[PDB]
Amino acid sequence: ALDKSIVVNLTSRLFADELAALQSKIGSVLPLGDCHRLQNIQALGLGCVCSRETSPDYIQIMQYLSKCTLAVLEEVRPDSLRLTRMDPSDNLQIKNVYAPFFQWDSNTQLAVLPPLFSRKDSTIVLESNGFDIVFPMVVPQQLGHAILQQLLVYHIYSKISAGAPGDVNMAELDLYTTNVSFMGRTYRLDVDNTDLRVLDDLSMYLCILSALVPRGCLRLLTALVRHDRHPLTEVFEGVVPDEVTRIDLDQLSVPDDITRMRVMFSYLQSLSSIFNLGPRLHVYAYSAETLAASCWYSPR
Amino acid sequence: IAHGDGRRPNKQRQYIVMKACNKHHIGAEIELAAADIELLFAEKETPLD
Amino acid sequence: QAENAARLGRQVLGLLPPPTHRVSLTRGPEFARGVRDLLSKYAASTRPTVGSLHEALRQAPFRQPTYGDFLVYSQTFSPQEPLGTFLFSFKQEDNGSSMDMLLTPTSLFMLSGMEAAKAPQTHKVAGVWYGSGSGLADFIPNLSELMDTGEFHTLLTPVGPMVQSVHSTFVTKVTSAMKGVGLARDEPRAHVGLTLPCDMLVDLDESCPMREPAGLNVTIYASLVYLRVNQRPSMALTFFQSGKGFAEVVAMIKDHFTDVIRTKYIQLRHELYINRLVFGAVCTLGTVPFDSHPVHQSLNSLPVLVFANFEAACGPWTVFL
């Protein structure tokens, strides 16, 4: 009964060179800030948020991701793009045209991650209309929840060397992070020795957490005595380090500790939702000679 | 074939087959010397000619 | 012989997805006369009849899940089935072209290597389905080391119920079902529900009047607990059933697995290995209708539950602790 289609218009035509880059794909996954079918170009990319002159981000993308609506290409006419709307719990078809290449499989979990690599892999500049479209980085969830894993490690040790040289060895760091192991296969990626900046904001948080976090648990331990005190909490003294439990409340008075605890969990809830609420799907049928990934959209 | 086993059954099939033609050439040759074609235009001046 | 194919023109052209409702304007205000299932309140009368409500049942909601066609050995997946089991999809490396490995929950008990009386019912039954718990362990030589670092819960994508299995000498075709209500095969118009062994399920709902409200939803979960028995690593699996929301059940599962937390974490006084600290995961296996009675069964004995009107909906393996 229902009908769905999203037809994006343009002011002008395109160059014939760009059409070969947009017949590189004919079915892929676009985010889209609207739900309606006639729309100007300025929302289908990530150039609504991620642009060159802006400081590129991870979290302000990631907040925008789960709010956003997906849509899938069907045709590139020389004037207008035609899209197919991504309903909740709907089945439709993908071609896996993404860069850098990863191999898919049936019965994998798929998280839509934002791109963080070099520009020429992800984006396509539309030189006609001057606007940049950015494609999201479709990675499977087990890979997407591990491709960030070692890269986020790599950004932290880079800030160590640029202030203190004799602490991190580069051959150790290069060999263990940019070579991601999965499936039995390997994937060497782009290290960015061109000068990073997408993933400061997690390392901006996660260190400022990691000093506040063990200091925060001591006050939480000695403030719970009842006979409703949960029986598993007797055990977890053996887990917490011994140096953690040697801290007084001398240095931080009562008004200082409010600026800890009211702010402690405010990181974690801004942080726990951006590891979990990727707009996620599953793929149940796949063939490498056709490259037909097979979504069904779980709204999340 | 629709056969009821565990072998992965296959959908409809369709092939596209696409020909191309050739070109060929012939070249002959004729004996004509101009001492022949000279007397093609003069006439009548004797019953020999 | 086209009288055969005239039946095919019935069933195919009747069973299509509904077209996109679209009307060109030169017809005029006629489009709304092609609006039928948006109505709900039909026409009652004094003595209504099938002839008065045949329109009221001609409309029907549009529902169909999609299936997963698999190719299995005749060794991992048993030749006998109760046709309504639960599945997984083990995932190590794509060696074959279409060579898939599946795990029933009754199999996955034998893959673990836990005590007998912790699950006393299926252990007698799952010893005649398969060997000594080593015919399957020959396929993965990492089932000691997958237990160490905690990667086994990452390598399971649940599927749901079954629909059909044509079985041959070595190769078994498994037509599974995700996303909902699989139409049956050997009985037409039937709907293959989900079946659980009574041993593996542990309810969370049941209480004495002591009061909680109803709804539309109750959600089968799927636990997976890494324990250690006889100083050897071995997992543990249970189920759950509670229409109580994700914030409650994580606070209630930990009371059920209290002693299993209590046994293991005494041992870490003298040692610590950061790969060992992960404990369990919870997936979401989908939704069950409210107040549908799980009818008990018996198979050669093995008490087997059933859930009519189960619909499937998978989820991620969210770690808990």
Description:
The structure is cut from a larger assembly and holds chains A (300 residues), B (49 residues) and C (321 residues). In chain A, 31% of the residues lie in helices and 20% in strands. Chain A is an alpha+beta fold. Chain A has three domains: 1-140 and 275-300, no CATH class; 141-190, no CATH class; 200-274, no CATH class. In chain A, the strands form four sheets. In chain A, strands 2-4-5-1-3 form a five-stranded mixed sheet. A five-stranded antiparallel sheet of chain A has the order 6-14-13-7-10, covered by helices on one side. In chain A, strands 8-9 form a two-stranded antiparallel ribbon. In chain A, strand 11 (179-182) and strand 12 form a beta hairpin. In chain A, helix 4 runs antiparallel to helix 5. With 49 residues, chain B is low in regular secondary structure. Chain B contains one helix and no strands. The radius of gyration of chain B is 36 Å and the shape is rod-shaped. Chain C is α+β, with helices and mostly antiparallel strands. In chain C, a hairpin with a 3-residue loop joins strand 2 and strand 3 (171-176). The termini of chain C are far apart. Chain C contains seven helices and nine strands. Classes of the chains: A alpha+beta (300), B little secondary structure (49), C alpha+beta (321). Chains in contact: A-C, B-C. Chain C: One of its GO terms (biological process) is viral capsid assembly. Chain C: Pfam families: Herpes_VP19C. Chain C: This is Core gene UL38 family protein.
Q: How far is the first residue's CA from the last residue's CA of chain B?
A: 87 Å
* β-strand amount of chain A: 15-25%
Largest interface: A-C, 27 and 34 residues
Query: What is the count of helical runs of chain B?
Result: 1
Oligomer: part of a larger assembly
Counting DSSP H or I runs of 4 or more residues, the number of helices of chain A is 7
Intertermini distance of chain A? 25 Å
Biggest sheet features of chain A: 5 strands, mixed
Q: What gyration radius of chain A follows from the Cα positions, in whole Å?
A: 23 Å
The backbone outline of chain B, from C-alpha atoms, is: rod-shaped
In percent, how helical is the residue content of chain A? 25-40%
The level of helicity of chain B is 10-25%
Instruction: Assign the structural class of chain B, choosing from mainly alpha, mainly beta, alpha/beta, alpha+beta, or little secondary structure.
Output: little secondary structure
Radius of gyration of chain B: 36 Å
H/E topology pattern of chain A: EHEEHEEEEHEEEHHEEHHEE
Largest sheet of chain B: none
Number of strands of chain B: 0
Shape of chain A: elongated
PDB class: virus
Keywords: human herpesvirus 8, human tumor virus, dsDNA virus capsid assembly, HK97-like fold, virus
Entry title: CryoEM structure and atomic model of the Kaposi's sarcoma-associated herpesvirus capsid
Chain A: Triplex capsid protein 2
